[PDB]
């Protein structure tokens, strides 16, 4: 009877918490993508070369949202992202709360 409105409210709540701290979420996302790229490289290649991301995007700087320019799309990354987005309810709420915590640790 009321589970529909309950789920609507909790989904709106997670959307709110994700929206008010989108900057940290996107920074963490692009950092995670770069981490995956760098660990694949260091597993295959030789040297980390911190500027590897620089010489990589230079092919095809200051831009807080690099997500529209998808430059690295290794399949297991999208597999993990799909696994995270298909997570059940009352758990994405936990993800949003943890993102809020890591975003506002100073206030915490």
């Amino acid at each position: 009877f009321t589970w529909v409105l309950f789920l609507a409210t909790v989904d709106s709540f997670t959307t709110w918490l994700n929206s008010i701290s989108r900057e940290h979420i996107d920074i963490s996302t692009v950092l995670r993508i770069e981490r995956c790229m760098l660990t694949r490289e260091i597993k295959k290649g030789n040297v980390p070369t911190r500027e590897s991301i620089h010489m990589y995007y230079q092919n095809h700087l200051t831009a807080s949202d690099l997500l529209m320019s998808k430059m690295f799309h290794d399949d297991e990354l999208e597999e993990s992202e799909k696994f995270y987005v298909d997570q059940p309810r009352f758990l994405l709420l936990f993800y949003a709360m943890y993102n809020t915590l890591v975003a506002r640790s100073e206030m915490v």
């Binding site: 981490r35 995956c36 660990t39 260091i42 597993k43 990354l77 993990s80 696994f83 995270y84």
Partner: protein
């Protein structure tokens, strides 16, 4: 009518599974019940049960004869106990009154209350042997009837499995387990597969980590002189740091456990009370009193050494024997290929220039479902055990809480950078912390002349984390931290 076919099929499955699990886990049940019967009635004629099933667990070759010996002795005891119930036994003609002592010689420092053994009732020369002349004769003999039943049901299960091998021609499964198909390769596929793998080979991977915890339980719940002896041997065996370094002294440890449980039962049996001689620590000139004579596990009449304290030593002995068997059979390649390769790893490695060599697959990005559990148990547990170290140093306010707080602060400050280093230094520091923990345990045991529960949990979590640091799954986290 309608469901009897499928129901009987399920029932046959259940019957064969029960027979299999009993064939797999019979020795533990029979030995545990025998030790419990021995502890219940402490008198003689049960000392031989303890000899048999204390020198039979570590040495499996004797497990055949050590069963028939008990099978014969229990019926001998039943016959004797029934014979001791006739009306023509007359313990009156048998009983002895021990004469009171005087204030000068062999005096009890508590002279106004001599209410103890040898003085509050006429002693019987057979009570010290086992015959007690009880009336119902059924509640008096059930501890032996059930023991005989278990001893018979053992060989019953053995020969039933043999006959099941004969008909429906099969072979004895060398893979002694429950799920014969689940193996090491099937571990990191699904959560259910991991649960099956752990139900299969839990004790294989976590033997020592459990034997040490059992010894710590013995120390913490016994808390007397023999607990100090157990602490001495625990520190002596842990001092050998490498795994293969203690696989040499484990038989000596098992022999020590057997000898000590034998000595403890021979102490708890006391001295024959028919001769009215008393113990040297109860004379005219003596300094031992009730508290110190209870702490020391010495024989006595006014205070009885609690026999139930031997079940902890028995648990420790059983786990030590199982771990000895594990050490014995873990080098065989046939089992090493399936849920094997339990040898420790080198300590000079690094996540860089090695992530392409380890057989373990990556889990940091959490493709599957259990990978979240893997990353929460291999990366986010260090800080949890640090919080546990903090908690165990603010609950029981004592002088030993300084080391806990110091180590907690140090690791919580210099933690993030230490995981960059090769595991050598972090393992050295964690070993120093293990040493401090066990030293605190031993000192809190010695100073009893308190109640360590948080220290045991801290020790368990530290052992878990130490086992984690020497795993292949950690190099992926080290690579992520490098990134």
């Amino acid at each position: 009518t309608v469901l009897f076919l499928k129901f009987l099929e399920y029932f046959h499955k259940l019957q064969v599974f029960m027979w299999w699990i009993l064939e797999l886990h019979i020795i533990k049940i029979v030995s545990s019940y025998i030790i419990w019967v021995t502890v219940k009635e402490v008198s003689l004629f049960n000392y031989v049960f303890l000899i048999s099933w204390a020198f039979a667990l570590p040495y499996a070759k004797l497990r055949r004869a050590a069963s028939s010996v008990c099978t014969v002795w229990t019926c001998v005891i039943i016959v004797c106990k029934m014979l001791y119930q006739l009306q023509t036994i007359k313990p009156e003609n048998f009983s002895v009154n021990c004469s009171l002592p005087n204030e000068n010689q062999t005096n009890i420092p508590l002279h106004e209350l001599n209410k103890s053994l040898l003085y509050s009732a006429p002693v019987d020369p057979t009570e010290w042997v086992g015959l007690r002349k009880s009336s119902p004769l059924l509640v008096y003999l059930r501890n032996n009837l059930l023991m005989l039943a278990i001893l018979a049901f053992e060989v019953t299960v053995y020969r039933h499995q043999e006959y099941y091998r004969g008909r429906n021609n099969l072979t004895a499964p060398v893979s002694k387990t429950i799920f014969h198909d689940i193996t090491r390769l099937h571990l990191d596929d699904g959560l259910i597969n991991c649960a099956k793998y752990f139900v299969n080979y839990f004790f294989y991977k976590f033997g020592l980590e459990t034997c040490f915890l059992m010894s710590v339980n013995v120390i913490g719940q016994r808390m007397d002189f023999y607990a100090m002896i157990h602490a001495c041997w625990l520190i002596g065996v842990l001092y050998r740091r490498r795994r293969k370094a203690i696989a040499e002294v484990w038989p000596k440890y098992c022999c020590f456990l057997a000898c000590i449980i034998t000595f403890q039962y021979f102490v708890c049996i006391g001295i024959p009370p028919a001769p009215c001689r008393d113990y040297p620590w109860r004379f005219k000139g003596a300094y031992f009193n009730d508290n110190i004579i209870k702490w020391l596990y010495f024989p006595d009449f006014i205070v009885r050494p609690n026999p139930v304290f031997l079940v902890y030593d028995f648990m420790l002995l059983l786990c030590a024997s199982l771990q000895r068997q594990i050490f014995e059979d873990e080098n065989k390649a046939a089992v090493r290929i399936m849920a094997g390769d339990n040898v420790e790893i080198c300590m000079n490695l690094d996540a860089a220039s090695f992530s392409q060599h380890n057989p373990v697959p990556d889990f940091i990005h959490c493709r599957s479902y259990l990978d979240m559990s893997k990353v929460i148990i291999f990366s986010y547990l260090f800080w949890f055990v640090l919080t546990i170290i903090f908690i165990t140093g603010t609950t029981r306010i004592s002088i030993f809480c300084m080391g806990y707080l110091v180590a907690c602060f140090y690791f919580l400050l210099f933690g993030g950078d230490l995981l960059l280093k090769p595991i050598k230094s972090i393992l050295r520091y964690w070993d120093w912390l293990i040493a401090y923990n066990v030293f605190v345990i031993t000192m809190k045991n010695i100073l009893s002349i308190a109640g360590i529960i948080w220290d045991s949990i801290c020790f368990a979590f530290l052992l878990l984390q130490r086992r984690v640091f020497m795993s292949y799954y950690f190099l992926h986290v080290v690579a992520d931290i490098k990134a």
